[PDB]
Every structure is written in C-alpha cells, then in structure tokens.
Symmetry: C2
Subunit: 154 residues, 2 copies
C-alpha cells in the first residue's frame, strides 16, 4: 500500500481526534495484517469508493466509548451508551473519513465516503476484503483504538 | 423514500437471489422502520455513495448461510463457515448491490458500491444513519433473510 495513503490516514486520525476530542493522539506503527481481531464490543465501519474502494474500521471498549463521547460533549461526564452515544462514535469516525477523503484528493485520489454503520455485540468477528492495514492508536489508554483500513482495490 | 428506489432494490434482490441461487424467492412487504432490529447473527454490510449515500444490510443466520453456499457451490455440500464460504456470502450481496447500482443508473442516479463486510456476533445491534426501508425475503425458510436499506 502507498505510504502516501498510510500517511494520509495517520494525519486524518491525528488532526481529527485532536479537534473533536481535544486530545492529541499517539499514532503507532503501520502494519499489514491477514484478518481482523476485535477484542472489543463496539465496531464502526465506513466504506470508501472510487480511486480506492475498501473501508475504515475502528472499535474499542465500552469504557473508552464513554471517555470518547464525554470528550465530544465538551466535558460533560457520561456513562450511558444511549442512541446519541452511538452517533457520537459514528460522528467521530465519519469526520475522520471526511478528512481522509480530502487528503486523498490532493494527491489525486478521488474517493467518496459512505455514512457510518455502528455495530455492537458480544463475541464479535468481522470479515473484510482487500489488503488490511493496521494502525495502532492511543487516545486515553495505551492503544485503546485498534483501527484498520482495507483496500480491495485502489 | 423514493419508491422508484425500493423498486430497483426488490427487483435487484429478486433477480439476483434468483440467478445466483437459481431459486425465485418471495419478497415480503416493504416496511419503513425507525431502526434496524437484528433477528440473526450474520450481517453483510455494503455501502453506497454518489446519487445516494446509504447502506445495504443483509441479515441471515449461520444455518441460512451454509445453504446459500451449497446453493452457490453447484449445490454440493457445505458444513463449515470458512473463508471461502464467507467470500461467497459477500459476492452474493455484492452481485446484488451491483445490480441495484445498475438499475439506478438507468433512472438517472449514479452511485458507487463498496466491497462487503461480513460481521457476526451474539446480541447484535446495528446503528444506522438516515431514512430506513425494511424488506423481508424468504429463500429457504420463511423470512430467512431480512434486508435493510438506510439512505442519505
């Protein structure tokens, strides 16, 4: 996969979780993986079409979901994964793909971002297609966001 | 939601769950829902961009899944749900969305399709965004496939 892409992703995650959560993230080291293990119970999926067709998938614990939402809410404490709570997460990732989309444009990659689809369950397993990039991310805890970027084509 | 779309969807599903699986299915009755109530454990999610922004979410069971595989793999037998089985499952949803897209093209709207993502779990709950259309499908069992098309 193109480092430009990998970099384009990194910047989007960095800039985004800084403006929305107000905290500077710690991007980890890029890494190709064969499948996707979800240790959590909350997973979001965002499609991408065009220059590159695949996806952006990120998940995390319920405890982290809260700190996340509470952060988007300016500071208001929180502890209830209501409907808006799911929208919070969905909004976070959407804004991310939103920035990733713009950055790919500059480099000449015209892609379109799909709305998010937030899934939550117990023993979760996902099956994506294309080459799976893994980007380690530390927001509040050490690596509390295990994000992936699939590229079927592009 | 533009019935001209539900139109392209049910026909797409129909014409696809028909040629790929060789069986004509019964499309239930189009419903409008406030959210997606997941009655199964395996979902196939496919996204739409362009003319419309939304998704296509097939919901089916593990049992229902292997019957699709066998129905695709020349009708032989299939017991485990391994990667191949999975890739088959996606292609089916993918071939559908592909036809939905193709029908959309002829009515003005230009849309692009995302590759599918199969997810599975205990106590599933999918949060979707936008307006939603529910369409029940019966292939083998009665309503063994519940599909949702959330939009813009």
């Amino acid at each position: 996969m193109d480092a430009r892409i990998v970099n384009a992703l990194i910047g989007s995650v960095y800039e985004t979780i800084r403006d929305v959560l107000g905290i500077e993230p710690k991007t980890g080291k890029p890494s190709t993986v064969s499948h996707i293990e979800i240790p959590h119970s909350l997973v979001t999926v965002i499609g991408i079409t065009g220059g590159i067709e695949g996806s952006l998938i990120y998940s995390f614990s319920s405890e982290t979901a809260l700190k996340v939402v509470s952060a988007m809410m300016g500071g208001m404490e929180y502890n209830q994964l209501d409907e808006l709570a799911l929208s919070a997460i969905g909004e976070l990732g959407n804004m991310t793909a939103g920035k990733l989309a713009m950055k790919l444009e500059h480099l000449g990659k015209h892609v379109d971002i799909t709305p998010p689809t937030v899934v939550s369950g117990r023993d979760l397993k996902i099956k994506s297609f294309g080459v799976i990039l893994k980007l380690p991310i530390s927001v509040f805890s050490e690596e509390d966001f295990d994000l992936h970027l699939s590229v079927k084509s592009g």
